[PDB]
Amino acid sequence: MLQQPTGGYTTLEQFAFTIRNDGTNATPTQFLQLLSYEATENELVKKTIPTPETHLPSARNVPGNVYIEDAITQALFGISAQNVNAHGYFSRLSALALPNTSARLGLDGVIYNSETINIPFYDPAAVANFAATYAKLGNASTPRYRADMIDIYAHVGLELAGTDAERAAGVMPVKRAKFDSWEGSLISLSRDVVNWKILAFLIDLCSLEGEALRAFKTRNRDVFRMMLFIMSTAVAANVVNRKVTKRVDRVLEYIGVNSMRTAGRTATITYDLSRHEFAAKFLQLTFTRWN
Amino acid sequence: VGIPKLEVDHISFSNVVSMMTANIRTGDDMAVERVNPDDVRAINIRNA
């Protein structure tokens, strides 16, 4: 079980997160700086977010040994995922929040019926509060319940390049990111983030309380910023390379605006239409719960 | 550290970068339609 560590499940250290800065790994805090910010004459307003309708898909138990945690990490960051929004996996998960259910979430991220001995997991109460909230994403696709997209992205930007006087205020000028590069760097970081066990960071974002939370948000303010950037890459429209001195540089065109497609079909990772339907309803939950 | 393969002056046998497809074959090509404006009388030229 591992019970739960007080101060997070992310303070354990068995499973952490390191972006591979080429031949040598690093920490998310250490990577953010290699990037600078260019203020352009465009402005976004921080728009309020609507509440999420409470109606997570009912319990079914088809027998699949569903890799729910693996599926989640794949769509947001994964390189060209397929059938991400199919209905069967989530429905199975929602069974989890149920008081008294022989169905334990494996530590490795695989869900089971009944149990096992050889495999340690997360105590049933930690997962109960988790699936209470991320089961809802399941039906994000329905015509009626479906979430926005062209507007949640007014938040992505403040975090990635949000100046402190800017996230203190409401409006931030449209920025333009640019950082050093190794050519295959955009895909390379996206290939890397896929294995962070992003389950651990979320299954504890619903279990931590009033003080343990105040300390959690003030430390992992990076581990969040990271997956936000890699995600904001697929969305922004034009990638321009600058050849200076003996250096080479990647510019991400606009941090805060949904172009609606492409980014660079070759220079980065792309988002299908069944991705904007997903990544959107995702951010609508983590953001709200986050703040 | 590690001098580039050129400007050092000795022949060697190193690596390359390849791919799998024939490229020109997808069984397709850009297929676009064009609809004619209609009358030649009322077409706008004056956009400067």
Next chain:
Amino acid sequence: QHVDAESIMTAPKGKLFHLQFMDGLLRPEPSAFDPPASGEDMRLIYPLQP
């Protein structure tokens, strides 16, 4: 084999017919350049087992 929605309302009580269900997990998606689509497929039946 394809059945009809009118026959699914007149089938004798104890006569078990087979009706095949389509998979489609492993199917290569279309190329970037090709004709689009207009108001497509509607499916009318569902098993509740599974």
Next chain:
Amino acid sequence: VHMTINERAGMSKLVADNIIASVIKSNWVVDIHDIEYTAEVMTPSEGYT
């Protein structure tokens, strides 16, 4: 929606169709303005032709 059309110029016959296909499945109320017609009243029997 209450989508109104002023002129059918660049109506790609594919997307020129997709509007009608959306009238019968989303209750879309469309419009046209350049069409002339001389329809006339008809009697019960004899019906349409």
